[PDB]
Structures are given as structure tokens and as C-alpha cells.
Symmetry: C3
Subunit: 211 residues, 3 copies
């Protein structure tokens, strides 16, 4: 006929699609990882070549981690020093910061602050980034203003343009299927959540050995 | 035998389920969209015909957008004026508001406020909705109370019944697979995240041309 | 040849993988549930046998619910009394509490508080757990300190070790595919979101009848 399969065979194939996925649902996980790998490739320039995205470490770094993070995210605050320590112990490693507004208004405001500072004065970014991360309270307008005053960045205006960069980060995180912070792109892998320094150190080395 | 497929063929089919999804994981995306389309159809009356859900624009509107949103969500605040502007420029378009408690306690409180106002005095809803959206701070009990005082709605009690409407919105968002705000139902599409006015304007027109 | 399927049959099978999942996307839901069931089994000891995780009810309980929850989550606050009431009406039912830091810094701080109290003085945990849940405001350092003072637990230090327990809860929630609170493990089911007492009462009975 016009079909290579018999109708009875077609019916069994359809049943086998269900049975295979229900009995071996790990296939779905593998498929999602494959979808993530393709997303990393398609969004590569947004990840690594966005001039508006702050960078910690050498511009000439041979490995670049991409940190999707939130200044109001508790394990982001605790993980960020570990990311920065990698750049200190491994000069060939840099970290790109992708602030996200996940935890609400103050997160967006904080992100707007660091992104505006980065554009106006890149060298001044790190101090504010760190001050916001080490803050032990949920951020608000007053505390963010204090952070900028305390890092000598209070002269720098928060721009509407920086909110577009922030929106790009948000769109990027969605395209990569990231729905939690901290999320860290390391080579072909997206690390979900914080990890201790030794594990991070191992993972970056495994990726350093691939260059 | 009792099988249209040979055992060897069955084995290859199972392998092909995996290989097909891993090599072409876009199939999963298409399947999720199909699942979303079915969800929109099954939850149609909860979406469009819930009297307890506030509406912006004409009751006789031929196109109705459903805005899943959060008063503590930064890009919700910035996107909402665009949704309202559509109803001003396109009188045949209305917007149904589905407040969500995603960003925590104050979000629920704020939602409770607008939903309670809608039930007691529908015409009084819009002012409070707008005041809460334009608020530049993470909401709290005091700021929500100020919003109600500033919109002459402070006489209206927050009801436990409005918390049921809010719970319905939450359950609805889950059934639709919405895990982020703002999410906007436009015809057969669920728009993820905010978009600029011109893009929104194009999308609504494409849907207006289908009526 | 080396293939049980003809090439034309292979092509049709690949097409049928797509068509089956797009026409019957409920298969994906069933597959995810299967993946959840396997996750519950593999993470069983983290769920039920973590000494660092607070328990409400009898240690010798024959049914144990696992409550993934957040002190800044509005419907968590309203659902928790229902979970505790089950343990009062059904002494053979206990509830394990898994605090999560989803809503930000104060959530982590609050979780750190209850987990630190549990380890130092288990009997003192419940009062603080309840006080934090009944709090009508988004928590902050001051309000958390007040909660501890008001429950005679302010002598107990927040430990860095409790932050590891909290991180375990977070990792556990991810492995189980939980991306919202309250999430309640009941036997082989993961209940998403809050439910009224009568429905909860029915579900626990259905699981009680399986022991």
C-alpha cells in the first residue's frame, strides 16, 4: 500500500511510544538535555558575547562560565564568592554575570543598578555586585541606594536601557530552560544550584582539559 | 503470532523512540504546546467566564486577553500599561486579570485586595490595580493599605472568599503549565513574558483577523 | 539486512513518535509521573529518614507525609494548619517538614532558624514553625528574631550546618521535580498546592487503607 507499516504494526508502534517513555522515562531527561545543548549553541552569542553583560576575570580567558543569578537568592549569595575564587585561582577562567529579576521588584532594581554601573564604568561594577550579594537582608530601594553609596557608585543613574539588558537575560534564561538560581553554564553543561568549591573546582578543571 | 511486529522490530522501535526524541527534541516542545492547547480548551470557562475575575475593557469585547500577573513582578508592572493601552486603542479588545501570589505574602494580600474590591464594587477595581502596579517598592501590609486609601477603596474589606478566587487562579496557572509572570493568553497562544507594545499590537491584530 | 525494520518502516516509526506525542500529549504527563515515582523511590531515605528534618506527630507513625513548604508562601501558611490537624485527628499520621528558600533571603533565614532549633532542641521546634507560618508579613531579620523571642528559642544560634540541611531540601525538591510550594508527598503521590481539609482527609485515608 502507501504505508511501509501494516495498520496493526502502526497501532503497536503507537503503544510502544507510550510504553517506552513510561517504562524508561529517563529518555525524557536525555531529550531535555539534548534540547538544552541545542539552546546553548543557538544562544551562544547572547551568553558569551553580550558587551552589556558584566564579566569577572580576564577578557582573554579561555574558559568562561555564565552565572545566572539573583541578588535576593540566598544560595546565590553564598555561591558567588566561590565563582569569584575560581577566577582568582584559575586566571584562565572568567565569569559572566547574568542578573535575573526572579525574586521580585528589588531584584530588578538591584540588577538595574549593577548593569547601569557596568555600562558607565565597568571597573566599578565588581564592588557593587559584591556588596549586593553580601547583604544579609532582602533588598529594597533604601538598601540598594546604601549599597551604591557604600561602593562609590551612587553618582551613576539607573537607566531604562539597563532594564532591556535585564529583560534579555530573562528571555535568555527561559530559552535555556532555567527556572531557578543560581544556574551556571560551564562549557556544554548547565549546573543547577550551588555546589561546594571542590566540586566546582573539579568541574571547571574537566572543562579546562577540553581546551 | 499475537504481535504484528517481530520482537527484533519491537526492539528497534523502542530504540527509535529514544533516538528520535534525542536527535529531534523539538518534538517535545511541539507536544507541550499541544498539551497547552488542550489545557486552554478544557479550562476555557475558568479563563474567560469567571465572574470573580476582574476585566479591563468592554464586556462585549470580541477578543479577550487573559493576563496572568503578579503585583510584585517587575516586568508585570511595566507590561500592564501596554495591555491596558491595547484596550484603549482597540475597543474590541478586553483584558481579564488573573492575579497570582507567586512572589509571596504581599502578592497574595495585594491580590486579595483587588479581588475583594472587584466583587464589592467592580468599577472601583481599576484604580487599585493600577496603583499597585505602579508602586516602585515590594508591597507590604502598610503599602497595600496606602494603595487602598489612595484609591478610595480602604472601606472595602479583604474577604476570605477572594482568597478562594486567588487559589483558583493559582490552580488554573498550573493546569496551563504557567510557571512565570507575566503570562498572557491571546487566542490559542500563551505569550510568555513581557513584550514591547508594537509586538503585542501585531499579535492581537493577528488574532483580531481571526474573528 | 542488519535491520529488522525496512528503511521506509523506520521513517514511519520516527514520524509516529512525533504524531503520537503531539496527538496524545497526555503520554508525556504519564511519563513525568513515572519519573516522579522513580524519584520518590530513589530519594526515599532523604525524604523519610533524615534526622535533621523536623517531624510533626508520632515517630512511630505508620503513614508519613512530607511537606515541602516555605514560610513566606501564602498558601503554605494556610495549608500547614490542615496538615497539623491531620496528625491530631489521625495519630497514626506524622508530617515531616522540608523548609525551602524559594521566596528569597528571609525564607532561608527562617528555615535556618527552625532547622537549628530542631537539632538543638526538637521539642522546641513546633512553636517556632507555627509562629513563622502564622506571621502575616513577609519575614525579615527583625521579624524572625521576634518569632524566636516570642517562642523562647532566641537563645538558639542559627548554624551554618542547618544551611546544609536546607540545601539538601532544595536539591531534593529539584530531584523530585517540585517547582512550587506547598508540595506534599503522600505515599506514592506528590500533592501539588494546598487543598481543603476534607480532600486532604480523603487522600490520607486512601493511603491509610494501603497499610
Amino acid at each position: 500500500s502507501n504505508a511501509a507499516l501494516k495498520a496493526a504494526q502502526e497501532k503497536e508502534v503507537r503503544a510502544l511510544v507510550r510504553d517506552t517513555l513510561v517504562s524508561n522515562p529517563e529518555i525524557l531527561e536525555e531529550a531535555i538535555m539534548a534540547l538544552q545543548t541545542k539552546a546553548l549553541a543557538s544562544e551562544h552569542d547572547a551568553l558569551y558575547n553580550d558587551a552589556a553583560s558584566p564579566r569577572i576575570g580576564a577578557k582573554d580567558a579561555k574558559l568562561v562560565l555564565v552565572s545566572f543569578t539573583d541578588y535576593n537568592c540566598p544560595y546565590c549569595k553564598r555561591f558567588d564568592p566561590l565563582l569569584e575564587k575560581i577566577t582568582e585561582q584559575y586566571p584562565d577562567v572568567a565569569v559572566i554575570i547574568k542578573p535575573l529579576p526572579f525574586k521580585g521588584e528589588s531584584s530588578a532594581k538591584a540588577s538595574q543598578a549593577v548593569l547601569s554601573v557596568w555600562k558607565e564604568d565597568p571597573k566599578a561594577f565588581l564592588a557593587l555586585h559584591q556588596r549586593l550579594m553580601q547583604k544579609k537582608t532582602m533588598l529594597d530601594n533604601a538598601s540598594i541606594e546604601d549599597a551604591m553609596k557604600s561602593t562609590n557608585t551612587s553618582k551613576i543613574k539607573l537607566t531604562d536601557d539597563s532594564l532591556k539588558t535585564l529583560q534579555n537575560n530573562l528571555e535568555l534564561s527561559r530559552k535555556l530552560g532555567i527556572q531557578g538560581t543560581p544556574a551556571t553554564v560551564i562549557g556544554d553543561t548547565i549546573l543547577p544550584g550551588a555546589v561546594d568549591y571542590d566540586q566546582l573546582e573539579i568541574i571547571v578543571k574537566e572543562q579546562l582539559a577540553k581546551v
